[PDB]
């Protein structure tokens, strides 16, 4: 069993698969950084509770888009919504607001996730995010815009291990690269997360595919 609820890991567990409308393609930093990719760093503050710090390398390895993450979580309360596993097994729609970071050659994002709690309350998870390109080539630095997310969480009836099946759709809104041309079809995805929350160590491996033409992610994650 994971030491934390699966919904608290969703945002950490590949924004290059967002479906940017034709008129917004010049604002897609994520695909423009490919194939060498980018580093995504977050601090996630669970209000009235602990925090995650995450660092992810997102790049192509051959034909596979890989998301390799290190997560460190501290200061979570025994009694709280996270360690108490009081979060509902679902995920609300959210808008992720992206701004260019000109000092670095990348972007920042901010958003606050609302996790439904089983007693009817809401657990906030405030996200601060920064992305920096790995490669030396030019990248697309966007005007202000946002990504609109939709998520459904489910379970595989066949799966014995602790796991999460996820289907998501993501489109850009609020308002061109050769890297974009790497996403014209279905792309296999591999996610690897090494985690430590409050001293409890765990790993997650995910496999699936992304289809940026429709903004679709289909992934199954398994914990160890």
mmCIF file of C-alpha atoms in Angstrom:
data_model
loop_
_atom_site.group_PDB
_atom_site.id
_atom_site.type_symbol
_atom_site.label_atom_id
_atom_site.label_comp_id
_atom_site.label_asym_id
_atom_site.label_seq_id
_atom_site.Cartn_x
_atom_site.Cartn_y
_atom_site.Cartn_z
ATOM 1 C CA UNK A 1 0.000 0.000 0.000
ATOM 2 C CA UNK A 2 1.126 3.527 -0.785
ATOM 3 C CA UNK A 3 1.818 5.691 2.287
ATOM 4 C CA UNK A 4 -0.238 8.441 0.583
ATOM 5 C CA UNK A 5 -3.498 8.474 -1.396
ATOM 6 C CA UNK A 6 -3.177 7.927 -5.133
ATOM 7 C CA UNK A 7 -4.934 11.258 -5.944
ATOM 8 C CA UNK A 8 -2.106 13.189 -4.241
ATOM 9 C CA UNK A 9 0.348 11.822 -6.844
ATOM 10 C CA UNK A 10 -1.681 12.514 -9.997
ATOM 11 C CA UNK A 11 -0.147 15.902 -10.790
ATOM 12 C CA UNK A 12 3.374 14.546 -10.309
ATOM 13 C CA UNK A 13 2.835 11.394 -12.404
ATOM 14 C CA UNK A 14 3.785 14.764 -19.039
ATOM 15 C CA UNK A 15 2.401 18.121 -20.127
ATOM 16 C CA UNK A 16 3.860 17.721 -23.620
ATOM 17 C CA UNK A 17 0.706 15.728 -24.447
ATOM 18 C CA UNK A 18 -1.560 18.761 -24.039
ATOM 19 C CA UNK A 19 -3.612 19.501 -27.154
ATOM 20 C CA UNK A 20 -2.678 23.060 -28.188
ATOM 21 C CA UNK A 21 -5.160 24.606 -30.653
ATOM 22 C CA UNK A 22 -3.753 25.534 -34.052
ATOM 23 C CA UNK A 23 -3.645 29.249 -33.223
ATOM 24 C CA UNK A 24 -1.791 28.568 -29.940
ATOM 25 C CA UNK A 25 0.915 26.209 -31.237
ATOM 26 C CA UNK A 26 3.556 28.934 -30.901
ATOM 27 C CA UNK A 27 2.970 28.847 -27.110
ATOM 28 C CA UNK A 28 3.707 25.119 -26.573
ATOM 29 C CA UNK A 29 6.976 25.170 -24.635
ATOM 30 C CA UNK A 30 6.706 21.504 -23.657
ATOM 31 C CA UNK A 31 6.871 20.051 -27.166
ATOM 32 C CA UNK A 32 9.441 22.609 -28.322
ATOM 33 C CA UNK A 33 11.915 21.327 -25.706
ATOM 34 C CA UNK A 34 11.786 17.803 -27.206
ATOM 35 C CA UNK A 35 13.549 15.493 -27.848
ATOM 36 C CA UNK A 36 16.088 16.476 -25.163
ATOM 37 C CA UNK A 37 13.198 17.449 -22.906
ATOM 38 C CA UNK A 38 12.938 19.538 -19.768
ATOM 39 C CA UNK A 39 13.251 19.333 -15.989
ATOM 40 C CA UNK A 40 10.015 19.947 -14.078
ATOM 41 C CA UNK A 41 10.363 20.985 -10.432
ATOM 42 C CA UNK A 42 7.476 21.511 -8.025
ATOM 43 C CA UNK A 43 6.749 22.371 -4.454
ATOM 44 C CA UNK A 44 3.282 21.108 -3.499
ATOM 45 C CA UNK A 45 1.968 22.580 -0.240
ATOM 46 C CA UNK A 46 -0.880 20.609 1.327
ATOM 47 C CA UNK A 47 -2.607 23.306 3.345
ATOM 48 C CA UNK A 48 -2.735 22.575 7.095
ATOM 49 C CA UNK A 49 -0.470 19.579 6.356
ATOM 50 C CA UNK A 50 2.873 18.588 4.803
ATOM 51 C CA UNK A 51 4.510 19.236 1.451
ATOM 52 C CA UNK A 52 5.988 17.406 -1.530
ATOM 53 C CA UNK A 53 9.070 18.564 -3.378
ATOM 54 C CA UNK A 54 9.466 16.899 -6.776
ATOM 55 C CA UNK A 55 12.023 16.869 -9.576
ATOM 56 C CA UNK A 56 11.204 15.185 -12.874
ATOM 57 C CA UNK A 57 13.162 14.630 -16.070
ATOM 58 C CA UNK A 58 10.768 14.526 -19.058
ATOM 59 C CA UNK A 59 12.372 13.547 -22.365
ATOM 60 C CA UNK A 60 12.304 11.100 -25.226
ATOM 61 C CA UNK A 61 14.240 7.879 -24.787
ATOM 62 C CA UNK A 62 13.974 6.443 -28.281
ATOM 63 C CA UNK A 63 10.294 6.208 -29.170
ATOM 64 C CA UNK A 64 9.108 6.468 -25.541
ATOM 65 C CA UNK A 65 8.288 9.659 -23.652
ATOM 66 C CA UNK A 66 9.742 9.100 -20.170
ATOM 67 C CA UNK A 67 8.841 10.915 -16.945
ATOM 68 C CA UNK A 68 11.388 10.055 -14.212
ATOM 69 C CA UNK A 69 10.555 11.645 -10.862
ATOM 70 C CA UNK A 70 12.130 11.997 -7.440
ATOM 71 C CA UNK A 71 9.631 12.941 -4.709
ATOM 72 C CA UNK A 72 10.385 13.972 -1.114
ATOM 73 C CA UNK A 73 7.472 14.610 1.260
ATOM 74 C CA UNK A 74 7.741 15.925 4.808
ATOM 75 C CA UNK A 75 5.722 17.148 7.781
ATOM 76 C CA UNK A 76 2.517 15.212 7.124
ATOM 77 C CA UNK A 77 0.154 14.819 10.066
ATOM 78 C CA UNK A 78 -0.829 11.393 11.411
ATOM 79 C CA UNK A 79 -4.387 12.703 11.817
ATOM 80 C CA UNK A 80 -4.575 14.541 8.497
ATOM 81 C CA UNK A 81 -6.293 13.898 5.192
ATOM 82 C CA UNK A 82 -3.202 12.475 3.471
ATOM 83 C CA UNK A 83 -1.800 9.989 5.985
ATOM 84 C CA UNK A 84 -5.337 9.274 7.162
ATOM 85 C CA UNK A 85 -6.310 8.259 3.620
ATOM 86 C CA UNK A 86 -9.445 10.410 3.771
ATOM 87 C CA UNK A 87 -9.330 11.611 0.153
ATOM 88 C CA UNK A 88 -11.971 10.508 -2.332
ATOM 89 C CA UNK A 89 -10.811 8.423 -5.295
ATOM 90 C CA UNK A 90 -11.540 11.038 -7.951
ATOM 91 C CA UNK A 91 -10.057 14.213 -9.405
ATOM 92 C CA UNK A 92 -11.720 17.530 -10.218
ATOM 93 C CA UNK A 93 -11.092 19.664 -13.275
ATOM 94 C CA UNK A 94 -8.362 22.271 -12.837
ATOM 95 C CA UNK A 95 -6.803 25.069 -14.857
ATOM 96 C CA UNK A 96 -3.004 25.316 -14.771
ATOM 97 C CA UNK A 97 -1.746 28.849 -15.411
ATOM 98 C CA UNK A 98 1.526 29.095 -17.343
ATOM 99 C CA UNK A 99 3.844 32.096 -17.599
ATOM 100 C CA UNK A 100 7.147 32.490 -19.391
ATOM 101 C CA UNK A 101 10.331 32.528 -17.318
ATOM 102 C CA UNK A 102 12.776 34.679 -19.275
ATOM 103 C CA UNK A 103 15.745 34.476 -16.871
ATOM 104 C CA UNK A 104 15.783 30.742 -17.180
ATOM 105 C CA UNK A 105 14.816 29.644 -20.662
ATOM 106 C CA UNK A 106 11.542 28.089 -19.548
ATOM 107 C CA UNK A 107 8.176 28.485 -17.875
ATOM 108 C CA UNK A 108 6.559 28.685 -14.475
ATOM 109 C CA UNK A 109 3.118 27.436 -13.525
ATOM 110 C CA UNK A 110 0.871 27.927 -10.521
ATOM 111 C CA UNK A 111 -2.388 26.258 -9.561
ATOM 112 C CA UNK A 112 -4.213 24.973 -6.493
ATOM 113 C CA UNK A 113 -5.623 21.450 -6.583
ATOM 114 C CA UNK A 114 -8.817 20.732 -4.637
ATOM 115 C CA UNK A 115 -8.945 17.161 -3.319
ATOM 116 C CA UNK A 116 -12.399 16.101 -2.116
ATOM 117 C CA UNK A 117 -12.312 14.647 1.420
ATOM 118 C CA UNK A 118 -14.691 11.875 2.458
ATOM 119 C CA UNK A 119 -16.353 14.074 5.117
ATOM 120 C CA UNK A 120 -17.367 16.709 2.548
ATOM 121 C CA UNK A 121 -14.443 19.077 3.154
ATOM 122 C CA UNK A 122 -11.733 19.992 0.632
ATOM 123 C CA UNK A 123 -7.979 19.467 0.939
ATOM 124 C CA UNK A 124 -6.000 22.117 -0.949
ATOM 125 C CA UNK A 125 -2.688 21.299 -2.625
ATOM 126 C CA UNK A 126 -0.962 24.500 -3.745
ATOM 127 C CA UNK A 127 1.422 23.878 -6.658
ATOM 128 C CA UNK A 128 4.432 25.990 -7.585
ATOM 129 C CA UNK A 129 6.097 24.756 -10.767
ATOM 130 C CA UNK A 130 9.162 25.572 -12.858
ATOM 131 C CA UNK A 131 10.311 23.966 -16.117
ATOM 132 C CA UNK A 132 13.751 24.412 -17.659
ATOM 133 C CA UNK A 133 14.926 22.989 -20.995
ATOM 134 C CA UNK A 134 17.613 20.313 -21.062
ATOM 135 C CA UNK A 135 18.851 20.829 -24.607
ATOM 136 C CA UNK A 136 20.686 23.729 -26.192
ATOM 137 C CA UNK A 137 18.248 24.469 -29.026
ATOM 138 C CA UNK A 138 15.742 27.323 -29.054
ATOM 139 C CA UNK A 139 12.478 26.780 -27.191
ATOM 140 C CA UNK A 140 9.091 28.483 -27.438
ATOM 141 C CA UNK A 141 8.471 30.923 -24.587
ATOM 142 C CA UNK A 142 4.696 31.409 -24.303
ATOM 143 C CA UNK A 143 2.398 34.270 -23.599
ATOM 144 C CA UNK A 144 0.234 33.798 -20.521
ATOM 145 C CA UNK A 145 -2.267 30.984 -21.011
ATOM 146 C CA UNK A 146 -3.628 27.967 -19.186
ATOM 147 C CA UNK A 147 -4.138 24.224 -19.528
ATOM 148 C CA UNK A 148 -7.568 22.753 -18.778
ATOM 149 C CA UNK A 149 -7.515 19.269 -17.247
ATOM 150 C CA UNK A 150 -10.086 16.467 -16.989
ATOM 151 C CA UNK A 151 -9.340 13.279 -15.064
ATOM 152 C CA UNK A 152 -11.062 9.994 -14.214
ATOM 153 C CA UNK A 153 -9.515 7.496 -11.797
ATOM 154 C CA UNK A 154 -10.465 3.826 -11.841
ATOM 155 C CA UNK A 155 -9.282 0.337 -10.942
ATOM 156 C CA UNK A 156 -8.307 -2.616 -13.096
ATOM 157 C CA UNK A 157 -10.396 -5.653 -12.043
ATOM 158 C CA UNK A 158 -7.529 -7.923 -13.129
ATOM 159 C CA UNK A 159 -4.852 -6.084 -11.135
ATOM 160 C CA UNK A 160 -3.723 -7.639 -7.849
ATOM 161 C CA UNK A 161 -1.227 -4.962 -6.811
ATOM 162 C CA UNK A 162 -2.025 -1.525 -5.453
ATOM 163 C CA UNK A 163 -2.561 0.519 -8.585
ATOM 164 C CA UNK A 164 -4.312 3.434 -10.280
ATOM 165 C CA UNK A 165 -5.799 3.475 -13.787
ATOM 166 C CA UNK A 166 -5.991 7.007 -15.145
ATOM 167 C CA UNK A 167 -7.540 8.625 -18.210
ATOM 168 C CA UNK A 168 -7.038 12.352 -18.766
ATOM 169 C CA UNK A 169 -7.768 15.026 -21.373
ATOM 170 C CA UNK A 170 -5.859 18.326 -21.484
ATOM 171 C CA UNK A 171 -6.355 21.323 -23.772
ATOM 172 C CA UNK A 172 -4.683 24.727 -23.836
ATOM 173 C CA UNK A 173 -6.714 27.944 -23.803
ATOM 174 C CA UNK A 174 -6.607 31.607 -22.846
ATOM 175 C CA UNK A 175 -5.139 32.979 -26.080
ATOM 176 C CA UNK A 176 5.492 26.021 -34.699
ATOM 177 C CA UNK A 177 8.363 23.855 -33.469
ATOM 178 C CA UNK A 178 10.088 20.803 -34.860
ATOM 179 C CA UNK A 179 9.678 19.093 -31.479
ATOM 180 C CA UNK A 180 5.909 19.320 -31.940
ATOM 181 C CA UNK A 181 6.282 17.016 -34.954
ATOM 182 C CA UNK A 182 7.318 14.183 -32.590
ATOM 183 C CA UNK A 183 3.745 14.082 -31.225
ATOM 184 C CA UNK A 184 1.656 13.695 -34.372
ATOM 185 C CA UNK A 185 0.598 10.159 -33.395
ATOM 186 C CA UNK A 186 0.223 7.851 -30.386
ATOM 187 C CA UNK A 187 3.364 7.891 -28.220
ATOM 188 C CA UNK A 188 4.216 5.252 -25.581
ATOM 189 C CA UNK A 189 4.832 6.652 -22.101
ATOM 190 C CA UNK A 190 6.915 5.353 -19.198
ATOM 191 C CA UNK A 191 6.664 6.954 -15.736
ATOM 192 C CA UNK A 192 9.037 6.099 -12.881
ATOM 193 C CA UNK A 193 8.631 7.686 -9.448
ATOM 194 C CA UNK A 194 10.959 7.150 -6.481
ATOM 195 C CA UNK A 195 9.296 8.523 -3.355
ATOM 196 C CA UNK A 196 9.886 9.174 0.335
ATOM 197 C CA UNK A 197 7.010 10.666 2.351
ATOM 198 C CA UNK A 198 7.555 11.171 6.093
ATOM 199 C CA UNK A 199 10.314 8.564 5.860
ATOM 200 C CA UNK A 200 8.137 5.949 4.140
ATOM 201 C CA UNK A 201 9.801 4.902 0.890
ATOM 202 C CA UNK A 202 7.920 3.695 -2.168
ATOM 203 C CA UNK A 203 8.112 3.542 -5.950
ATOM 204 C CA UNK A 204 5.545 3.836 -8.719
ATOM 205 C CA UNK A 205 5.872 2.632 -12.300
ATOM 206 C CA UNK A 206 3.401 3.689 -14.965
ATOM 207 C CA UNK A 207 2.898 2.611 -18.562
ATOM 208 C CA UNK A 208 0.533 3.827 -21.224
ATOM 209 C CA UNK A 209 0.305 6.161 -24.156
ATOM 210 C CA UNK A 210 -0.338 9.774 -25.006
ATOM 211 C CA UNK A 211 -2.104 11.262 -28.011
ATOM 212 C CA UNK A 212 -1.453 14.996 -28.249
ATOM 213 C CA UNK A 213 -3.794 15.417 -31.230
ATOM 214 C CA UNK A 214 -6.704 14.902 -28.814
ATOM 215 C CA UNK A 215 -4.866 15.692 -25.563
ATOM 216 C CA UNK A 216 -5.409 12.178 -24.221
ATOM 217 C CA UNK A 217 -3.435 10.251 -21.595
ATOM 218 C CA UNK A 218 -4.170 6.610 -20.761
ATOM 219 C CA UNK A 219 -1.911 5.179 -18.069
ATOM 220 C CA UNK A 220 -1.872 2.441 -15.453
ATOM 221 C CA UNK A 221 0.343 3.007 -12.408
ATOM 222 C CA UNK A 222 1.508 0.261 -10.051
ATOM 223 C CA UNK A 223 3.095 0.799 -6.640
ATOM 224 C CA UNK A 224 5.913 -1.159 -5.009
#
